[PDB]
């Protein structure tokens, strides 16, 4: 009738068991694909709240007492919120608006790990960098990232080839637009014949109005050309239209001759 009673030893929780998913928004967000993130014990009444907060993650029940974890399954970062920046790798969306810091009731959406190295941003930024939505910093850095795109997957190099062709066509139409001036600047920075010749081609396919306003060093007047012969030095070291012309619209010939001065 007398039972040998003996209560268990006092329990000591571990780091896993003291976790709170309501505090790990800076730990779950930087998780990579198929990486388990233990969030500690989680009550059922708070299941959906987590699932609605992290839709890119699957909620798995690892242990007893509600011990759960989040396993990344997606990168739902939209192209406009991920491609037009170079350091915002994730964001939160509440109602309809997007913030970069966490807010109550917001939903996490993460950008692709290396999204400026895959070509996923070429289509969005090709249209975004045209017109009033052009950015002097983001678009220039995107054209620069195109020249250093460390993507050797057939899809990535094919996408950047298509982007190169679209850029050649668009800048052959009108090179005065800002995105094409940045493209010519980066081509000049490349400093290879494959880039110098494309610079010269794009500049030579321009209208007379473009040349009479931007390319007055490369295409001198009859009088300036006649008088340049009276001097032994190159005309570029003599013509004020060369000393004042922007470097992005100079032919490789004049760009090189300007280096001969002094």
């Amino acid at each position: 009738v007398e039972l040998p009673k003996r209560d268990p030893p006092p329990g000591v929780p571990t780091d896993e068991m003291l976790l709170n998913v309501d505090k790990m928004h800076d730990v779950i967000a930087p998780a990579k694909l198929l990486e388990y993130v233990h969030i500690g014990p989680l009550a059922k009444d708070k299941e959906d709240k987590v699932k609605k907060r992290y839709p890119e993650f699957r909620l798995v029940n690892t242990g007893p007492g509600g011990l759960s974890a989040l396993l990344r399954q997606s990168y739902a970062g939209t192209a406009p919120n991920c491609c037009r920046t170079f350091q915002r790798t994730h964001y939160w969306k509440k109602d309809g608006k997007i913030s970069d810091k966490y807010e109550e009731g917001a939903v996490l959406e993460s950008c692709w790990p290396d999204v400026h190295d895959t070509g996923k941003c070429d289509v969005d930024l090709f249209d975004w960098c045209q017109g009033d939505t052009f950015d002097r910093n983001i678009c220039h850095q995107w054209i620069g990232s195109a020249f250093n795109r460390a993507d050797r997957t057939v899809e990535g190099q094919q996408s950047l080839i298509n982007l190169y062709n679209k850029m050649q066509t668009l800048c052959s139409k009108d090179a005065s637009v800002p995105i094409c001036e940045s493209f010519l600047h980066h081509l000049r920075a490349h400093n290879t014949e494959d880039s110098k010749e494309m610079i010269d081609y794009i500049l030579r396919q321009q209208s007379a109005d473009f040349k009479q306003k931007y390319m007055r060093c490369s295409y001198p007047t009859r009088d300036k050309l006649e008088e340049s012969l009276k001097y032994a030095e190159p005309r570029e070291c003599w013509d004020p239209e060369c000393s004042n012309a922007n470097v992005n619209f100079l032919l490789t010939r004049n760009y090189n001759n300007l280096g001969l001065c002094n």
Partner: nanobody
Amino acid sequence: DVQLVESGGGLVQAGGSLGLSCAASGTIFAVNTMGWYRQAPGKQREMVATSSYYGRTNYADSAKGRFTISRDNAKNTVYLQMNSLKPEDTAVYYCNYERVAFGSARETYWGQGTQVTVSS
């Protein structure tokens, strides 16, 4: 795609001459580099002479002084006048059309190749 057609190879004597022609047809995109490469039996495909869209010529040491590459962009054709031929030049000559995008991606299209057989 791009299609290259070679023409002009055959039998020539020692110290003779012969002209090769390569015609490009298809989705051309202006600025490019077209050239001639040789392949001897048992050897690797090596460079003979390449030229850019504006005539930046690059000759191999074996081709300097004898061969001359020319280009007609109006018809998208590249020509190679080979002079003072020697038996070592006996090879299958292909032409290539190379397009480098952003200094990162390369697109090279080759032709079927014409046989050049130089006798003594």
